[PDB]
C-alpha cells in the first residue's frame, strides 16, 4: 500500500504528483548506462495515461510498476548467462511465448532491428519494446488466423489494412 | 557497475 507508494515519490522528482515521460526514464535502467529508451517509455506511459497528461500518477502507476515489473520477470528468466544483455541463444528461448516457433535467424532480423545498443545483443529497455511492436503485429496476424495453424491467406486490401492498422 | 534492468532504487 505503501511499497507501491514510496517507489512512486522516489520517482516523481518535481513533486508535482504526476511521474513524467523523462522522470520515469531517469529513474529506469536499461543496464547497460544508456539511458533507458524513450520509444519504451512512452509506450508505457501513454499506456497508463487515461487524461493525456503524458504521465501517471499513483492509480495509474500501479498499472505502470506491475506492467514493468512483469517485464524484468521475463527478462530476468530468459537472461540465464546474467549478464543484462539477452543474446540470440537466449532470444530464442524467449519469443517462445507468441505460439508459433519461428526459424533460428528470423531472431537476426529482431535483433537487428531493435538493439539500440549495436552490441548484437538485446538490453531491457529494447526487449520490451521489441515484445511491444511484436504483440502489435500478432493481434492484427490472429484477426486472420481463424485457422489457428500459425498461416493466413489474405487479399490485396486486407494486406494493405494490416500495414495501416499499424497505429 | 550498471543498475540492473528495471527501477533503479537509490543506492545502485
Ligand atoms: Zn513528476
Ligand atoms: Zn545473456
Ligand atoms: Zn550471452
Ligand atoms: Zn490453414
Ligand atoms: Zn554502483
Keep these: 500500500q505503501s511499497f507501491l507508494w514510496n517507489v512512486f515519490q522516489r520517482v516523481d522528482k518535481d513533486r508535482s504528483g504526476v511521474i513524467s515521460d523523462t522522470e520515469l526514464q531517469?529513474?529506469?535502467?536499461?543496464?547497460?548506462?544508456?539511458?533507458?529508451?524513450?520509444?519504451?517509455?512512452?509506450?508505457?506511459?501513454?499506456?497508463?495515461?487515461?487524461?493525456?497528461?503524458?504521465?501517471?500518477?499513483?492509480?495509474e502507476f500501479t498499472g505502470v510498476?506491475?506492467?514493468?515489473?512483469?517485464?524484468?520477470?521475463?527478462?530476468?528468466?530468459?537472461?540465464?548467462?546474467?549478464?543484462?544483455?539477452?543474446?540470440?541463444?537466449?532470444?530464442?528461448?524467449?519469443?517462445?511465448?507468441?505460439?508459433?516457433?519461428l526459424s533460428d535467424q528470423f531472431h537476426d532480423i529482431l535483433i537487428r532491428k531493435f538493439d539500440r545498443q549495436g552490441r548484437g545483443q538485446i538490453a531491457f529497455d529494447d526487449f520490451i519494446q521489441g515484445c511491444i511492436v511484436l504483440q502489435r503485429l500478432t493481434?492484427?496476424?490472429?484477426?486472420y488466423d481463424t485457422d489457428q495453424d500459425g498461416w493466413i491467406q489474405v487479399s490485396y486490401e486486407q494486406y494493405l489494412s494490416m500495414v495501416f492498422s499499424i497505429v | 557497475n550498471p543498475?540492473?534492468?528495471?527501477?533503479?532504487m537509490h543506492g545502485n
Design chain 1, 26 to 59: 531517469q529513474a529506469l535502467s536499461n543496464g547497460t548506462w544508456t539511458p533507458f529508451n524513450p520509444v519504451t517509455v512512452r509506450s508505457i506511459i501513454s499506456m497508463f495515461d487515461r487524461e493525456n497528461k503524458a504521465g501517471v500518477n499513483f492509480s
Design chain 1, 139 to 143: 493481434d492484427i496476424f490472429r484477426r
Design chain 1, 65 to 101: 510498476w506491475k506492467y514493468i515489473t512483469d517485464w524484468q520477470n521475463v527478462f530476468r528468466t530468459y537472461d540465464r548467462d546474467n549478464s543484462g544483455m539477452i543474446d540470440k541463444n537466449e532470444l530464442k528461448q524467449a519469443l517462445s511465448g507468441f505460439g508459433y516457433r
Design chain 2, 3 to 8: 543498475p540492473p534492468p528495471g527501477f533503479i
